[PDB]
Amino acid sequence: KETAAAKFERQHMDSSTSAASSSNYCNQMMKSRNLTKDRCKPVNTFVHESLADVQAVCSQKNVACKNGQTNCYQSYSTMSITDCRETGSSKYPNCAYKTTQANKHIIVACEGNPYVPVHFDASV
Structure with a gap:
């Protein structure tokens, strides 16, 4: 049904804003x-x-994933x-959420052909 790449985009991508819109961003x-x-x-x-720019991280700094798999990648830029x-x-x-905006390096797990992000591991 839902591709791994599509699930990543639904759970983790919000290009439509430059930051957290507001204190209510996470709730909505x-x-x-x-x-x-x-x-x-x-x-x-x-x-x-x-x-x-997020898909390009699959070609950036290879780092261990938190689950010990080897297919995680850290952005050279802050995002x-x-x-x-x-x-x-x-x-x-x-469900109730505290919203925090940050500018940080991201770490994502990538998979597939094409090689795309499927999991958001960490920010640093």
């Missing part, structure tokens, strides 16, 4: 990207850069990102 986006459907996803990161972190007050089905 976690909902609209269907990450509060079956439970409140506790944490999530959105990347504000172009799809082409505009928004971190979403579920609050203590959050109870499913009204």
Whole structure:
């Protein structure tokens, strides 16, 4: 059904803004990207850069993934990102999130032919 690449774009890509729109960004986006459907996803990161710039990270600095696989890549540039972190007050089905914008290096896992991002590992 949903490709791994498509799932990455739905969960992690938001090129349509340059930063976190507002303090309510994570509440709206976690909902609209269907990450509060079956439970409140506790944490999530959105990347504000172009799809082409995020796809280009698959050719950048190869680093170990947190799960010990070898197919993770760190961006040479900093990127505009928004971190979403579920609050203590959050109870499913009204998932509640603190929005934090940052400019950080991203780490993504890449797979497939073509070789594309499928997982957001970390920011640094």
